[PDB]
C-alpha cells in the first residue's frame, strides 16, 4: 500500500481535490488507501469511492469498445490482414480493465461488505459488487463467463432483496440498483423482458411514493426515475 503512510483524513481530502481536478485515477488510489485503513466508510466516503472507480472503469470500457469494434472489422471477409496489433492492444486494455474490477471487488470482499450492516451501506456495496462483475462479464468469453454472470446476478439479487425490505421505493440507492440490474438483464443475461419489467415496476412503485418526499429528496428520486424511463424508451 503506497498510501499506508498518509493519514486517512488526508487521503479523503486529496480524493476530493483530485475530483475537482478531474484526476480520477488519483482519486481512486486515494480512496483505495482510505478503505485500506480498515474503518467503515461514511456515506460521503462511499460515494467518493464509487465516483472514482466508475470514472476510471468507464474510460476503460469506452476504449475497449472502440478497440473491439476495430478488431471485429479487421475480421470481416475482405479486410486486409494487419497482424496481431489490434488484438494485442485490445487485450492490453482488457487486462487493465479486469485489474481495476478485481481491485474494486477485492476492496468489497476485504472487508467492506462483511462489516456493512445498515441497508444504505450494504445495498450500496452489493450494487457495486454486481456492477463490477457486470463489467467483467462484458469482456468475458471463456470457461468462466457463465460463472461471472451468475456472480453479478447473485450480488444484485441480494441487494434487491435487502432494498425491498429496508428502503422506501424512492430511495435513490434502491432506484439506481434497479436501473443497473435492469441493464444487466438486458445487456448481459439476454433477458430483455425481465429488464423491461423491472424498470417499469420500479418506476411505478417510486411514482406512488413521491408524495412523501421533501423538495430536495423529490429531485434526487425523480432524476433516477428519468433514467429508468429513458431506458424503457430505448427498449420499447
Amino acid at each position: 500500500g503506497a498510501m499506508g503512510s498518509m493519514e486517512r483524513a488526508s487521503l479523503i481530502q486529496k480524493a476530493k481535490l483530485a475530483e475537482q481536478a478531474e484526476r480520477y485515477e488519483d482519486m481512486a488510489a486515494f480512496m483505495k488507501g482510505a478503505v485500506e485503513k480498515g474503518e467503515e466508510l461514511s456515506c460521503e466516503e462511499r460515494n467518493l469511492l464509487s465516483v472514482a472507480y466508475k470514472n476510471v472503469v468507464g474510460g476503460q470500457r469506452a476504449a475497449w469498445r472502440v478497440l473491439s469494434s476495430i478488431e471485429q472489422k479487421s475480421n470481416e471477409e475482405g479486410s486486409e490482414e494487419k497482424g496481431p496489433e489490434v488484438r494485442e492492444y485490445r487485450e492490453k486494455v482488457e487486462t487493465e480493465l479486469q485489474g481495476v474490477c478485481d481491485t474494486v471487488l477485492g476492496l468489497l470482499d476485504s472487508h467492506l461488505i462483511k462489516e456493512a450492516g445498515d441497508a444504505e451501506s450494504r445495498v450500496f456495496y452489493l450494487k457495486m459488487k454486481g456492477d463490477y462483475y457486470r463489467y467483467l462479464a462484458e469482456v468475458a468469453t471463456g470457461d468462466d463467463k457463465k460463472r461471472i454472470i451468475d456472480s453479478a446476478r447473485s450480488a444484485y439479487q441480494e441487494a434487491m432483496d435487502i432494498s425491498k425490505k429496508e428502503m422506501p421505493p424512492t430511495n435513490p440507492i434502491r432506484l439506481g440498483l434497479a436501473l443497473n440490474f435492469s441493464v444487466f438483464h438486458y445487456e448481459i443475461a439476454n433477458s430483455p423482458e425481465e429488464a423491461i419489467s423491472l424498470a417499469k415496476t420500479t418506476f411505478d412503485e417510486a411514482m406512488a411514493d413521491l408524495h412523501t418526499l421533501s423538495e430536495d429528496s423529490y429531485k434526487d428520486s425523480t432524476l433516477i426515475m428519468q433514467l429508468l424511463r429513458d431506458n424503457l424508451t430505448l427498449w420499447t
Binding site: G176, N180, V183, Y186, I224, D230, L234
Partner: peptide, 5 residues
C-alpha cells in the same frame, strides 16, 4: 448504451 449509475 443504456443509462446506469
Amino acid at each position: 448504451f443504456p443509462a446506469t449509475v
